[PDB]
C-alpha cells in the first residue's frame, strides 16, 4: 500500500523527510518489479504454454511472438530475488547502488539489452499477425477470448500485456532519477546510481534501434515486391540507368513518408519518398505498386545534392543535384506541414552530411 504505513511503522519516526521519500521510491521499484514478474508469468501461463502445448499456430510463428520468454522471466526473476534478499536485512534499505549496477552496468547490461531487444524487435509485426489470425481462424479467435477472459488478465488483452516489457524498461530511468533526487550527494552511492541511470538510457537506445531495424527491414522487404523499375532499364537519361536493378533490401532506411513534387508549371505529383543511407528515392504510389520512372532522375545520390530551404513556403524545400553532368536539375518538394518540412530538413542534412 505504502512504505510508511506498512513495513517500518515503528522506525518511521527517527527518519528525515529525504530519507523517507527515498525509501518510498525504493519500495515502488521493488513492488512494481514483482508486479511485472507477475505480468510476465501471466503471459507464460495463460498464453505461451497453452498456445504451445495445444498448437494454436506453427512453431515458427510462435517463435516470432515469444522469442525468449523464459530468459526474460529469468532476468527479472534473478533481480527480484536480489531485491528480496536486501529487503530482508532490514525494512530500511541502506545502499542500493550495487544492486542497480548488477542489472544495468557492464555484462549485466549486455545480457539485458540483448534479451529485451530480441523480445521486442519483432513484436509490432507479430501483433499484426495475431490480429489477422483472430479474423481468419475461428479456432484461434476462441482460444484468445477464452484466455483473456481469465481473471489474472485484469481484463486486458494479449496485445496490451505483451508490450509491458518495453514499458517496464522505460520506467527504470524515471525510477532511478527519483531515487537519485533523494540520495545524499557526494556519496559513492549517488555517483553509482547516476552511472546506472545513464546506462539505462543506453539500453533503451539499444532496444530503440533493434526495433527500428527489424521493423525497417521487414518494411523494405515489403516495398521491394511492389516495386516497378521497368521504365528504367531503357529510360531516357543514364542518370537513372544504373538503378534498374535497385533492391531496397541491401540499404538502410533513415526516414520515409509522403511528399508532393512541384515538377512543372503548375503540374504537381504525389510521391512517397524513402531516405536511405546513400540515396533519396522517389516512388509514386500507383495502387498496390511503387514506380521508379523519369528530364529528372528518380534516384538522387546523396553525396551529390544540396538542401535548400524556402522563404515564404513553410512546407516546401529544394534539393539540388550537384553533379556537373546532369544540368540544372532541381527538385522542389512539398511536405505535409511546417513540422514535417522541418523534420525532413534535419534528417536530410544529416544524411547528406554523412555522405
Amino acid at each position: 500500500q505504502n512504505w510508511q504505513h506498512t513495513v517500518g511503522k515503528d522506525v518511521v519516526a527517527g527518519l528525515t523527510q529525504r530519507e523517507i521519500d527515498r525509501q518510498e521510491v525504493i519500495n515502488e521499484l521493488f513492488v512494481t518489479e514483482a508486479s511485472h514478474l507477475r505480468t510476465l508469468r501471466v503471459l507464460d501461463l495463460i498464453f505461451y504454454q497453452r498456445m504451445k502445448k495445444e498448437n494454436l499456430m506453427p512453431r515458427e510463428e510462435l517463435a516470432r511472438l515469444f522469442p525468449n520468454l523464459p530468459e526474460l522471466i529469468e532476468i527479472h526473476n534473478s533481480w527480484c530475488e536480489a531485491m528480496k534478499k536486501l529487503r530482508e536485512e532490514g525494512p530500511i534499505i541502506k545502499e542500493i547502488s550495487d544492486l542497480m549496477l548488477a542489472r544495468f552496468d557492464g555484462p549485466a547490461r549486455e545480457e539485458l539489452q540483448q534479451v529485451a531487444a530480441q523480445f521486442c524487435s519483432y513484436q509490432s509485426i507479430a501483433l499484426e499477425l495475431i490480429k489477422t489470425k483472430q479474423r481468419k481462424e475461428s479456432r484461434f479467435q476462441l482460444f484468445m477470448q477464452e484466455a483473456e477472459s481469465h481473471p489474472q488478465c485484469r481484463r486486458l488483452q494479449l496485445r496490451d500485456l505483451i508490450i509491458s516489457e518495453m514499458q517496464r524498461l522505460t520506467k527504470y530511468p524515471l525510477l532511478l532519477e527519483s531515487i537519485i533526487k533523494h540520495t545524499e550527494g557526494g556519496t559513492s552511492e549517488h555517483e553509482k546510481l547516476c552511472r546506472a541511470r545513464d546506462q539505462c538510457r543506453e539500453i533503451l537506445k539499444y532496444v530503440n534501434e533493434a526495433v527500428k531495424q527489424t521493423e525497417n527491414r521487414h518494411r523494405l522487404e515489403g516495398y521491394q515486391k511492389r516495386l516497378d523499375a521497368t521504365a528504367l532499364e531503357r529510360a531516357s537519361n543514364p542518370l537513372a540507368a544504373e538503378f534498374k536493378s535497385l533492391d531496397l533490401t541491401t540499404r538502410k532506411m533513415i526516414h520515409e513518408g509522403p511528399l508532393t513534387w512541384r515538377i512543372s508549371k503548375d503540374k504537381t505529383l504525389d510521391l512517397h519518398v524513402l531516405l536511405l543511407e546513400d540515396l533519396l528515392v522517389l516512388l509514386q504510389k500507383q495502387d498496390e505498386k511503387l514506380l521508379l520512372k523519369c528530364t529528372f532522375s528518380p534516384v538522387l545520390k546523396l553525396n551529390a545534392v544540396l538542401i535548400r530551404s524556402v522563404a515564404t513556403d513553410k512546407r516546401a524545400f529544394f534539393i539540388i543535384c550537384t553533379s556537373k553532368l546532369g544540368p540544372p536539375q532541381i527538385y522542389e518538394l512539398v511536405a505535409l506541414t511546417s513540422s514535417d518540412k522541418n523534420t525532413w530538413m534535419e534528417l536530410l542534412e544529416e544524411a547528406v552530411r554523412n555522405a
Partner: protein, 178 residues
C-alpha cells in the same frame, strides 16, 4: 461490454502520469506521488453508457521515436497534454506530437488537455517564465491550438486540486464512442 483504448501523450514532466493517477483513484496522492502508472482498465459511465477504458501512459518514451509507436495501434482516443506552466510544451503540440499522432492514428480523435492550470496564477511560476520573456499559457491559446490541430475538445485541469480531471476523461470517452 464496450472496450475502448486511451493513450495519453505529451512532453515529459508536464503532468501525464500525475493526471492518470488521480483519475483512476479519484483522489490526489497525499503521502507519496508514484512514478509508475501501469496499463489499467477503468470503468466509466457517460451518456448512460458503460465503458471499459484501457489507460496507457507513455511516460519514459519521449526520447525513443520507435518505441513510442508500439503504444499507438488500435487506439480509440488520444489525450495530448501540455503544461500551462510551460509554453514550450505547447508549441511542441503542433510541432512534435500531432504530426506523429495523425500518422500512427489516422482519424483517431484527439483531445487537447491543458495541465497544471492551478499555476496560471502562481507568482513563483509567473516569475520564472518572466525570466525568459514567457508567461503561463492563457485559455484562448489552448482553445486556439485545439481548433488548429483539429481536436475534438480542449480541456484544462489541475491534478493538484483534482479540478477538471473527471471532466477530462468523460470527454475522452465521449470521443471514443463517436
Amino acid at each position: 461490454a464496450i472496450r475502448k483504448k486511451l493513450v495519453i501523450v505529451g512532453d515529459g514532466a508536464c503532468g501525464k502520469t500525475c493526471l492518470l493517477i488521480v483519475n483512476s483513484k479519484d483522489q490526489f496522492p497525499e503521502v507519496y506521488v508514484p512514478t509508475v502508472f501501469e496499463n489499467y482498465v477503468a470503468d466509466i459511465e457517460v451518456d448512460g453508457k458503460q465503458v471499459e477504458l484501457a489507460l496507457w501512459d507513455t511516460a519514459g518514451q519521449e526520447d525513443y521515436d520507435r518505441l513510442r509507436p508500439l503504444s499507438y495501434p488500435d487506439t480509440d482516443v488520444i489525450l495530448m497534454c501540455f503544461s500551462i506552466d510551460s509554453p514550450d510544451s505547447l508549441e511542441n503540440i503542433p510541432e512534435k506530437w500531432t504530426p506523429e499522432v495523425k500518422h500512427f492514428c489516422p482519424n483517431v480523435p484527439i483531445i487537447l488537455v491543458g495541465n497544471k492550470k492551478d499555476l496560471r496564477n502562481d507568482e513563483h511560476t509567473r516569475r520564472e517564465l518572466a525570466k525568459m520573456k514567457q508567461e503561463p499559457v492563457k485559455p484562448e491559446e489552448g482553445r486556439d491550438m485545439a481548433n488548429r490541430i483539429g481536436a475534438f475538445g480542449y480541456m484544462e485541469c489541475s491534478a493538484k486540486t483534482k479540478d477538471g480531471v473527471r471532466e477530462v476523461f468523460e470527454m475522452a470517452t465521449r470521443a471514443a464512442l463517436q
